[PDB]
Nucleic acid binder design. Structure first.
Lengths: 92, 119, 47, 285
RNA sequence: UGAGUAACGCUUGGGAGUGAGAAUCUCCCAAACCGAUUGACUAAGGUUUCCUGGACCAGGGUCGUCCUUCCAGGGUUAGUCUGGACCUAAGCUGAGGCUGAAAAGCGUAGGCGAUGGACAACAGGUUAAUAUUCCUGUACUUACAGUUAGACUGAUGGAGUGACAAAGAAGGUUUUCCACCCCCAUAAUUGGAUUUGGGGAUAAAUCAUAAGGUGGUACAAUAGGCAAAUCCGUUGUGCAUAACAUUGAGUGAUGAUGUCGAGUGAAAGUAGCGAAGGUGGUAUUAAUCAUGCUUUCAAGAAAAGCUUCUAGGGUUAAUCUAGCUGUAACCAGUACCGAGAACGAACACACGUAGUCAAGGAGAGGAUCCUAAGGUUAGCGAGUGAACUAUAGCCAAGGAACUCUGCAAAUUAACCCCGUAAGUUAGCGAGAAGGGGUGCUUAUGUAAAAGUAAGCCGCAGUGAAGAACGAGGGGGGACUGUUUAACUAAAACACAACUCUAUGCCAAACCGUAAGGUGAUGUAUAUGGGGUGACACCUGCCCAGUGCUGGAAGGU
RNA sequence: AUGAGCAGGUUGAAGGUUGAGUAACAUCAACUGGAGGACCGAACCGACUCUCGUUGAAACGAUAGCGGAUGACUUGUGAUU
């Protein structure tokens, strides 16, 4: 852990649907170079909480702004979604 | 003359007029092309005249020109016809319905005719 | 109809790869002068 | 022996035959023992350069090399018993599996007449002669069918090891060296006596009686179909190209290369063995 | 400018609403096609095109409230799936290393290299975007460390394994099929009537039975496998009569009181609910046994991985097995389009585009006509239906009078039954020739039918569908075939076959400059060259000259 | 090198088996049999005929077809000139 790989959590409608369940699934944008071993480590050391399960994906960059006068490219980000034990969660 | 829309012959106009008479029997109003309205008025008048004998022969006969929908079945149409439509229009020697000329469409700016029947 | 070029991106990488073009001295010199040629794309990876 | 091919095909007529493979062989089903077989790769007509470097050859069906003893000196004075006669699709003959009495099975080249179960022995010492014996030339008298001769001693028999090939001794050089041999194809040399030999004739002698039949069967057996030189492109070959069967105009015609190569021998006139020239395929010295 | 000339690039009509305004936006209704697809899987390909909401300013072959158009936000989760971590096939690179003015070329150890191999999961659930990934339930593997007991382990090297073609055959096995049973719904207004349709079960995983297959089971000497060997081997003996080992369908028990269901259907047809969850065979079917089996020759993969023996050693247990416990199983992928408005094709076009299930009547069919779910009216429409034209359907009669000509067009067809010659390399011809038949009711007919008989019918009976046209003479080549991509398809080319020629091994020849390699891991019965070019009988002459070869004096 | 596929229904030669039969042959009867640069023929390949397109659906094809169609196989992946 570099104490920076836990970049930021996001709360979208699908994330709201995930968190309104029971296992309290949350999502963190993280550095795409770390393995789930040290990611889970960083998680049980930032709090007293170990993740119940982990899953990883990346938001693939696309041509952002589409066809326009000033198009561009979208950002690179890896989302790690964590399920926690049912009765416990994290107060961000 | 390879694959394309090939145009339409008697079969398509027959199915079109059958669909249109079923639709007008559903409500009592059609807005369509003037030519098809002129074609359909004859069959409509004959059908109104043909169902006044009310036997199984006439049942099959006047059934042979009806199509289906959800609000009305072809069985529903023949029942409605035989039940109420035939006895009312017996008081005229022809000219059951009226086909009136509307304005042009916005799709093709062509003459649209409204066919209706009231009593 | 089948055409002359196929979008096989792996065969594309084999045919016109950067590591393929740095394995040849002619390719290395071409990429050097293309750095001097103001080109944005030098190879497929440097597009 | 052979037998006429029965196909009852209605596309032309086939006048071809095929060898029985049973009265001369065994196990006419390709699944032999896994003892001494190594997979082979053909060159597809190409060199190591990637360029095609053989003429009208390509399309051979895949065949596996049988590991055959050639030096025949590692196992000496150990008695061998013929255990099988297995076909060799690479060479023009059928190899024989034998078992040296110490317990060592091995593939060898099968001389004509040997059968499964025959008892023979081969070494580097003067002994009697039975079919299959291999023993150096210095202890053998003239007048015997000998094949698998070794120009480089201790290397392995190379000359006259095709279908039904052998050589006959036409004497010994009176200086105690260079036994005189009649090589096949009419050549006659004074070959080194330092070398070994395999007695008798080699099996599978019916390659003088093989039938090729059609094009694609040979293509699968190897050689590709192609045109003569005198119908090639007018630059690649001036005699071909155009209308009217332009025939060959060059007396002693050439190749794509300007080879005046009719009747002329291309054997080296100044090799170290050129003093050992006796007969070249037509005449003397 | 042409010029409003052409065109607007595979398929509707009506009702209702939205919206100021709608063929093209939506709901509904129907249609008719595809239906071995016009149904879904995914490789690869495109990589946000995927989803929601708002909106229609630049494109929509007009329109466009809408679009796959723009704007804002958002969607793809993997100890067992695919793949890195397992490795190799061709192949590539390749230090050092060989050759070459140099750059460089070549090349070994090796390291890279799947389209293959080693290898542990299945099902239901649920979103606006996915899901062996997420959840639910039912399981599996893999070490790690400790513990319980047993227990000797043994590679670097040796042995085995993996390890394998095509073609073909008949069975095991349960499905399939059908009869019939259960259950559910169904009860008929037209003449007639007590009708009609559908469903009927479950995975991984564990256990048991394992059909059957595959074809040897132990004793010892080792002179063989760099060694060492208890492993292959080698030798016969005992059995060689059936054990022995391997394998192996299926079937059953759970799993599985679970999903689920005919169908019912409240706020939407959503949720809930959800009955039945049965037998006999089968001369129809594939599937699995099965790397099974039979045959042929052009003779049909490796490494990984597995087992094993000895070295290697340990034998205060290093160490192995399994129980139990704990720990943990990493890297990457996951949307959709996906035969096509998201591939290519510049393309909103109709084209070629991996594999694969691919249902019914019905048939040998994956052929054909009509259908089950599916999805929609091929990004321009609407009218009259001129000449002229594309497409057809047809023309009474002659019928080849048309032509350079039966060019083109048009009779034959599917199935069943009679009969077929010349020539013939005995295989064909041949569906030669030449004729007949195809329906229904009853009975007979095998297992159902064929088939037969009687009757009846049609204008005729594969009644719709799609179905080789023959005969002879001639030229060439035998043939089957390659063949001038986007003009010619051949009688060109090829081919078997043949004469001659050269190449004797470090073979010649070829490539490079060379090493060197193919040739070739070939060995004259092999290869090359040159030409001839089914089969058959022959190929006659001429060496003046050129040439080919050979020779040795003489001149040179 | 690596692979996938070749609907369909076809023929019964060879081989082998049994028997008659011959001193043995030979000869034939029947049986298994399933070989085929074999058959037609779905797919498929090619472009041989016809028509259309003749500034197209197409920088070149679309119809009916034709021939071939378990091999002088096709096709896919990778290498390779």
């Amino acid at each position: 852990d570099v104490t920076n790989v836990l970049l930021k959590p996001v709360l979208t409608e699908k994330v709201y649907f995930n968190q309104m369940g029971e296992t309290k699934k949350y999502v963190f944008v993280v550095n795409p170079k770390a393995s789930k071993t040290r990611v889970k480590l960083a998680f049980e050391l930032v709090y007293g909480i170990k993740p119940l399960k982990v899953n990883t994906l990346i938001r693939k960059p696309t041509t952002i702004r589409g066809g326009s006068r000033f198009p561009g490219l979208s950002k690179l980000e890896k989302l790690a979604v964590i399920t926690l034990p049912k009765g416990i969660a994290i107060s961000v | 003359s390879y694959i394309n829309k090939p145009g339409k012959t008697s079969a398509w106009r027959v199915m079109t007029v059958r669909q249109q008479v079923s639709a007008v029997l559903a409500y009592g109003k059609i807005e369509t092309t003037l030519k098809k309205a002129k074609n359909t008025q004859k069959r409509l008048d004959k059908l109104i005249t043909l169902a006044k004998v009310d036997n199984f022969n006439n049942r099959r006969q006047v059934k042979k020109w009806l199509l289906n929908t959800n609000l009305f079945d072809v069985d529903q149409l023949m029942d409605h016809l035989f039940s109420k439509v035939a006895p009312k229009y017996e008081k005229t020697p022809g000219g059951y319905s009226r086909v009136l000329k509307l304005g042009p469409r916005r799709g093709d700016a062509t003459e649209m005719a409204i066919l209706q029947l009231t009593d | 109809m089948k055409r002359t070029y196929q979008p096989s991106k792996l065969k594309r990488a084999k045919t016109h790869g950067f590591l393929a073009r740095m394995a040849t001295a002619s390719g290395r010199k071409v990429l050097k002068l293309r750095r001097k040629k103001q080109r944005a794309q030098l190879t497929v990876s440097s597009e | 022996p052979i037998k006429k091919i029965i196909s009852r095909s209605n596309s032309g007529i086939h006048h071809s035959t095929v060898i029985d493979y049973k009265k001369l062989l065994t196990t006419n089903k390709n699944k032999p023992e896994k003892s001494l077989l190594v997979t082979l790769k053909k060159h597809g007509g190409r060199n190591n350069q990637g360029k095609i470097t053989v003429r009208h050859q390509g399309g051979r069906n895949k065949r596996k090399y049988r590991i055959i003893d050639f030096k025949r000196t590692h196992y000496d004075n150990i008695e061998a018993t013929v255990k099988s006669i297995e076909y060799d699709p690479n060479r023009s003959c059928f190899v024989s599996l034998i078992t040296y009495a110490n317990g060592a099975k091995s593939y060898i080249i099968s001389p004509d007449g040997i059968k499964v179960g025959d008892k023979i022995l081969a070494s580097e010492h003067p002994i009697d002669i039975k079919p299959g014996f291999s023993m150096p030339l210095a202890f053998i008298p003239e007048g015997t069918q000998v094949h698998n001769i070794e120009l480089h001693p201790k290397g392995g028999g190379q000359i006259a090891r095709s279908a039904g090939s052998y050589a006959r001794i036409l004497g010994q050089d009176e200086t105690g060296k260079y036994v005189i041999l009649q090589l096949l194809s009419g050549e006659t040399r004074k070959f080194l006596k330092e070398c070994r030999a395999t007695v008798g004739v080699v099996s599978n002698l019916d390659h003088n009686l093989v039938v090729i039949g059609k094009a694609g069967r040979n293509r699968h057996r190897g050689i590709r179909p192609t045109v003569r030189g005198s119908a090639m492109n007018p630059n690649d070959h001036p005699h071909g190209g155009g209308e009217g069967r332009s025939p060959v105009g060059r007396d002693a015609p050439r190749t794509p290369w300007g080879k005046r190569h009719m009747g002329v021998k291309t054997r080296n006139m100044k090799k170290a063995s050129t003093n050992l020239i006796i007969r070249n395929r037509k005449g003397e010295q």
